[PDB]
């Protein structure tokens, strides 16, 4: 009757251990569409110079995103796309910059809620996927004395669970730049719950595939059931890294998110 | 009397070496002594430009404490700026710490910023004479200021009453350091459950020529410790000019906090 | 045909990651591939300001070679500036090296200074466009210049014919680097018994937009390698634009030097 | 008839693993006498920022001394006092700056000659003292492919052989600042012999004690017999570190060296 098409500024947020680099295919696809894209490295991830043992909470880990949202021009708003654990980064950011966030898009991601603790969906993912195969674990003591568990994701788990259907060049790239990470799960468990005013009010779009071999269909569906997203988009096929295995599709869904919310 | 395990922590620019007289003294009373070099200090191989905060500078201490066998507890003795290393360490490992001892040291608190006593000492002692300053940008973009302590400042202010062989030792191994003051100003305050919990003993001499009597008395009035031992005479480096006196006070702290 | 173990060495500012297409290609032919990050490159945790020479920058390669089991030999493939890493490594471990392969790379020699080809390339290509430069003083007092490669230089000169996802990858993980040119100018020349001994294969394309045809031809004429393979088309990053072509040439080198 | 007293500029050179710090007592003693003293850290020793794995020869190790001799004012000459392995540093320096060296003083030190290889007295010391007790050894490959052996001196060997009679505060200090070192013996063995024109012409004063428990009396005497020093001073008592156990005595002998050669 009247059709709308919008260009948007997407801020792409990687999961722990990874960096801005998993978005190297989705970032140009979105830009071919005319969108402005920002792909940030979070603390101690990608080529960020900090090491994980200096980070003391998932909030400290999210600093590159909050500084960037802090820096945004007045009246400029963004769509934050977060993969896997970055749903926690979108929740931490929306309770500070609700003002600047047009929509949060969860891409095979943790979908936090306001009702339960911040660690809640982490707990449920681990119930659902408890064996991380050849992942190695380590600990350090943080600034207030918490023991923080870090991990180096195993290469079979990378191969088979996260990068199941990705190109050899993509899987090899992952092995070349992957770093330690931390869920900071015990510190998230002591954290205040996300607020309804910030996080609770953000538009929320859930993209997922039932072919994901680490965020399994029964965890994903549980998340949608536990905290109804404003929109759900299921991508047929692909694997956990839909921004590599379904780059154009994810880009088209993101155009639709722009049209609706941006 | 009670033997204890002491972890001695030098101040910025210095190294485990300022404890070369006090470590044998304590060991002659049966104590176990660990004297660590903090990052970029003593013979630690790192340079100050790769250290980005005072919590990173504390790493040798936090790794040691991370590895103390379960159920062992130590008495951390810190000189001058090392009261900040006690506070950083006590927040992370409060249950491994039998007591913190401040030897002519900054005594941080829980109500003001981590940099609060750095701010107050520089107000008491704003002219560090021939000290030279430098800056680098740390990995998150802050400009850290480093210093190279001046030898007149070393001779007259810190090592005032020290032997010529001690003063000469100091000039031969002193390295650059930093207060990371602006990063401390941004740092979360020290917690009550960690640093606030620790038993605290403050040792000083009114003959210190850089942590001057009224600043030290201010600190004591700002955050009353459990015990204050005042040594007569000496200079800022009581572990060199009053070694046995400190060894004796440290015995009273082992006795009292096991 | 003959399988081999290749050690792939990235150029300054880059990381093991530029070999993400060539490492699987080679492995599909049964080769063993090691792709290392040099100091302060890729995800190596060091920063460029703690590296004080190109020999220190080579450390990841020299430690690997130090640890190769006795009697194993590798083919080192180095791109662009990494011909200096081959030469440094070949002088120390000549007997562990079956052949050095120079992929649009500096081909150092034994009669002129280590910096000689850095000098000649900068004469051929003096304007690095939007590259930014910085300096630090190294531990012995030299001023090292570091650079941050410019993205137009990346798009047009190095990654000319590269995919958009490859170019974008590059901007996402590129880090600072240094030629340590002045330190190389002071460095002892590469030895005949080490670097001079090694078998040498030179791979290039005349469509390189930064190691330009006449500089590459100059290098070949300055120090004739054993074999020169010229790939048609591509750009400076043949391991991304002509991956299979390089994988094939590398097979000929395994065949020939085991 | 006419008596002479001279003030001199002494450059004090530590042995491998150690630094300028073992001279912290002799340097002020010499200065009480009015002498100018310079105590240098050699590469990767004391607080020199270099690590031993970047040093490729004993010549590279001696760089702080050669740069300092390079920097000396015209017509200024120095007396170089070298303890233990620093006799090799005096030999390397005299073949470059014979011009600037009034005398070389060997202080419980290796006394190189011109007749044999540079490694010769190292070989003979190891024949004489072959077991370094709790010393740990390591290797790295140098710039031209040589494997270099490094060591961390054991604390019993420190206690009993090197610091036998030193103060507890001195022995503890040693443990607090001691670093790895290398004899670079295989690279000294391929090195050109020291020249007669440089090293061979320097005045040479040998200070030693027969109480030394690592450079033993029969090695010391052999050295004196193998290459006659211009003067020999035996200090009764003390231990290997005579600059700590006989500081004033060593200082008086050095005053006599100044009077004779400086």
Instruction: Please name the residue that has the structure tokens 């943790």.
Output: A110
Residues of chain D with C-beta less than 8 angstroms from the C-beta of C53: 54
Residues of chain B with C-beta less than 8 angstroms from the C-beta of D49: 47
DSSP B231: -
Copy the structure tokens of residue D224.
């004196």
Q: Evaluate the CA torsion angle D222, D228, D229, D234 in order and state its sign.
A: positive
Residues of chain D with C-beta less than 8 angstroms from the C-beta of B21: 169, 172
Is D24 within 8 Å of B172 when comparing Cβ atoms? yes
Distance between CA atoms of residues A62 and A182, nearest Å: 12
Distance between CA atoms of residues A15 and A153, nearest Å: 12
Q: Evaluate the CA torsion angle B84, B85, B86, B88 in order and state its sign.
A: positive
Helices (H), chain B: 22-27, 54-57, 59-67, 83-93, 116-124, 151-152, 164-173, 181-186, 213-222, 238-241, 243-257
Strand partners for D12: D39, D81
Distance from CA of A28 to the nearest CA of C (A): 7
Could you say which of D45, D84, D119, D182 is catalytic?
A: D84
Of the candidates D49, D50, D141, the beta carbon closest to that of C92 is on D141
DSSP A49: S
Neighbours of C124 (CB within 10 A): 15
Q: Is C139 on the interface with B (CB under 8 A)?
A: yes
Touching subunits of B (3+ CB pairs, under 8 Å) are A, C, D
First to last CA, chain D: 20
Strands across the sheet containing A231-234: A36-40, A9-13, A78-84, A101-109, A204-208, A231-234
Q: How far is CA A195 from CA A94, A97, A112, A117, in A?
A: 9, 12, 11, 11
First to last CA, chain A: 20
Q: Evaluate the CA torsion angle B158, B163, B168, B172 in order and state its sign.
A: negative
Q: Is D71 on the interface with C (CB under 8 A)?
A: no
Q: Is D149 on the interface with C (CB under 8 A)?
A: no
Of the candidates C55, C94, C139, the beta carbon closest to that of D143 is on C55
Distance between CA atoms of residues A231 and D250, nearest Å: 87
Copy the structure tokens of residue C135.
């300096």
Touching subunits of C (3+ CB pairs, under 8 Å) are A, B, D
Residues of chain D with C-beta less than 8 angstroms from the C-beta of C93: 141, 145
Q: How does strand B74-79 pair with strand B132-137?
A: unpaired
Q: By CA distance, what is A146's nearest residue in B? A: B92
At what resolution in Å was this solved?
Answer: 2.2
Distance between CA atoms of residues A87 and A110, nearest Å: 5
Is B53 within 8 Å of A54 when comparing Cβ atoms? yes
Is D109 assigned a catalytic role? no
Q: H-helix or E-strand containing D253?
A: helix D247-261
Buried b (16+ CB within 10 A) or exposed e, A99-112: ebbbbbbbbbbbbb
Instruction: Please name the residue that has the structure tokens 């048609």.
Output: C232
Q: Are chains D and A in contact at 3+ CB pairs closer than 8 Å?
A: no
Q: How far is CA C131 from CA C13, C126, C151, C216, in A?
A: 12, 11, 8, 22
Instruction: Please name the residue that has the structure tokens 């090296």.
Output: C97
Is C236 assigned a catalytic role? yes
Q: By CA distance, what is B56's nearest residue in A? A: A54
Q: By CA distance, what is C55's nearest residue in D? A: D143
Could you say which of C53, C58, C80, C115 is catalytic?
A: C80
Q: Is B83 on the interface with D (CB under 8 A)?
A: no
Buried b (16+ CB within 10 A) or exposed e, B163-184: ebbbbbbbbbbbbbbbbbbbbb
Neighbours of A234 (CB within 10 A): 15
Is C23 within 8 Å of A177 when comparing Cβ atoms? no
Is position C81 annotated in a ligand binding site? yes
Of the candidates D28, D47, D177, the beta carbon closest to that of B165 is on D28
DSSP result, C57-74: HTHHHHHHHHHSPTT--E
* Under 8 Å between Cβ of D99 and D199: no
* Under 8 Å between Cβ of D132 and D159: no
In CATH, which of 2.60.260.20, 3.40.50.720, 3.90.550.10, 3.40.50.1820 is domain A1-262? 3.40.50.1820
Distance from CA of C95 to the nearest CA of D (A): 9
Q: Is C173 on the interface with A (CB under 8 A)?
A: yes
Q: Quote the longest CA-to-CA distance of chain A.
A: 61
Taking alpha carbons only, the member of D19, C141, D17 closest to residue B173 is D19
Taking alpha carbons only, the member of A23, D190, B56, B175 closest to residue C168 is A23
Test mutation, B140, B180, B183, chain A, max A CBs within 10 A:
B140
Q: By CA distance, what is A23's nearest residue in C? A: C169
Q: How long is chain B?
A: 258
Is position B124 annotated in a ligand binding site? no
Strands across the sheet containing B5-9: B32-36, B5-9, B74-79, B97-103, B200-204, B227-230
Radius of gyration of chain B (CA): 17
Q: How remote is the C-alpha of D61 from its chain's centroid?
A: 13
Residues of chain D with C-beta less than 8 angstroms from the C-beta of C92: 141-146
* Under 8 Å between Cβ of A105 and A81: yes
Instruction: Please name the residue that has the structure tokens 């980064």.
Output: A89
Q: How far is CA A45 from CA A253, A256, C16, C49, C165, in A?
A: 27, 29, 16, 20, 20
Long-range contacts of A130-133 (CB under 8 A, 24+ apart): A132/A157, A133/A157, A133/A160, A133/A161
Distance between CA atoms of residues B36 and D33, nearest Å: 36
Copy the structure tokens of residue A64.
């590159």
C44 CB-near residues (< 8 Å, 6+ apart): C15, C37, C38, C60
DSSP result, A114-138: SSS-TTHHHHHHHHHS---TT-EEE
Radius of gyration of chain C (CA): 17
Strand partners for A179: none
Test mutation, C49, C134, C140, chain B, max B CBs within 10 A:
C49
Instruction: Please name the residue that has the structure tokens 């080192």.
Output: C76
Distance from CA of B186 to the nearest CA of A (A): 13
Distance between CA atoms of residues B107 and B27, nearest Å: 26
Q: Is B15 on the interface with D (CB under 8 A)?
A: yes
Distance from CA of B237 to the nearest CA of D (A): 15
Q: How remote is the C-alpha of B102 from its chain's centroid?
A: 7
Instruction: Please name the residue that has the structure tokens 């898009």.
Output: A105
Distance from CA of B88 to the nearest CA of A (A): 7
Q: Are chains D and B in contact at 3+ CB pairs closer than 8 Å?
A: yes
* Under 8 Å between Cβ of A199 and A98: yes
Distance between CA atoms of residues A54 and A74, nearest Å: 32
Copy the structure tokens of residue C254.
């395994």
Q: Method used for this model?
A: X-ray
Q: Is C47 on the interface with B (CB under 8 A)?
A: yes
Buried b (16+ CB within 10 A) or exposed e, A235-252: beebbbbbbbbbbebbbe
CA angle B50, B189, B213 (to 5 degrees): 90
Distance from CA of A171 to the nearest CA of B (A): 29
Q: How does strand B132-137 pair with strand B32-36?
A: unpaired
Test mutation, B56, B84, B89, B92, chain A, max A CBs within 10 A:
B92
B40 CB-near residues (< 8 Å, 6+ apart): B46, B47, B48, B50, B51, B57, B175, B176, B177
Q: Is D142 on the interface with C (CB under 8 A)?
A: yes
Residues of chain A with C-beta less than 8 angstroms from the C-beta of B66: 140-141
Residue A189 φ/ψ, nearest 5 degrees:
-65, -30
CA angle A213, A219, A222 (to 5 degrees): 150
Q: How far is CA A15 from CA A42, A88, A112, C87, D118, in A?
A: 9, 10, 14, 40, 59
Taking alpha carbons only, the member of C102, C108, C80 closest to residue C11 is C80
Touching subunits of A (3+ CB pairs, under 8 Å) are B, C
Instruction: Please name the residue that has the structure tokens 């906090």.
Output: B257
Q: Is B139 on the interface with D (CB under 8 A)?
A: no
Distance between CA atoms of residues B50 and C51, nearest Å: 11
What is the SS3 assignment for D25?
coil
Strands (E), chain D: 9-13, 36-40, 78-84, 101-109, 136-141, 147-152, 204-208, 231-234
* Under 8 Å between Cβ of C91 and D143: yes
Q: Are chains B and C in contact at 3+ CB pairs closer than 8 Å?
A: yes
Q: Is B93 on the interface with A (CB under 8 A)?
A: yes
Of the candidates D47, D170, D172, the beta carbon closest to that of B173 is on D47
Q: How does strand B143-148 pair with strand B227-230?
A: unpaired
Q: Is B60 on the interface with A (CB under 8 A)?
A: no
Copy the structure tokens of residue C251.
């097979």
Q: Evaluate the CA torsion angle B185, B186, B192, B198 in order and state its sign.
A: negative
Fold of C1-258: Rossmann fold (3.40.50)
Copy the structure tokens of residue C181.
């040119």
Q: Evaluate the CA torsion angle B136, B138, B143, B147 in order and state its sign.
A: negative
Radius of gyration of chain A (CA): 17
Distance between CA atoms of residues D250 and D84, nearest Å: 15
Q: Is C137 on the interface with B (CB under 8 A)?
A: no
Q: By CA distance, what is A17's nearest residue in C? A: C43
């Amino acid at each position: 009757p009247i059709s709308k098409m919008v260009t948007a500024h997407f801020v792409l947020i990687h999961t722990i251990c990874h960096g801005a680099w998993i978005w190297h295919k989705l970032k140009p696809a979105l830009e071919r569409a005319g969108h402005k894209v920002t792909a940030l490295d979070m603390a101690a991830s990608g080529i960020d110079p900090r090491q994980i043992e200096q980070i003391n909470s998932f909030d400290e880990y999210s600093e590159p995103l909050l500084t960037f949202l802090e820096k945004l021009p007045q009246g400029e708003k963004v769509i934050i796309v977060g993969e896997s654990c970055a749903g926690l980064n979108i929740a931490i950011a929306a309770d500070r910059y609700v003002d600047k966030i047009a929509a949060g898009v969860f891409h095979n991601s943790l979908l936090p809620d306001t009702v339960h603790s911040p660690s809640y969906t982490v707990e449920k993912l681990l119930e659902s996927f408890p064996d991380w195969r050849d992942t190695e674990y380590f600990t350090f003591t943080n600034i207030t004395g918490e023991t923080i568990t870090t991990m180096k994701l195993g290469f079979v788990l990378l191969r088979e669970n996260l990068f199941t259907k990705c190109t050899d060049g993509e899987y090899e790239l992952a092995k070349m730049v992957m770093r330690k990470g931390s869920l900071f799960q015990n510190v998230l468990a002591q954290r205040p719950k996300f607020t309804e005013k910030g996080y609770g009010s953000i538009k929320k779009v859930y993209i997922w595939t039932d072919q994901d071999k680490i965020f399994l269909p029964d965890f994903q569906r549980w998340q949608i059931a536990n905290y109804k997203p404003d929109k759900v988009y299921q991508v047929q096929g692909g694997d956990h890294k839909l921004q590599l295995t379904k780059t154009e599709e994810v880009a088209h869904i993101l155009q639709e998110v722009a049209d609706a919310y941006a």
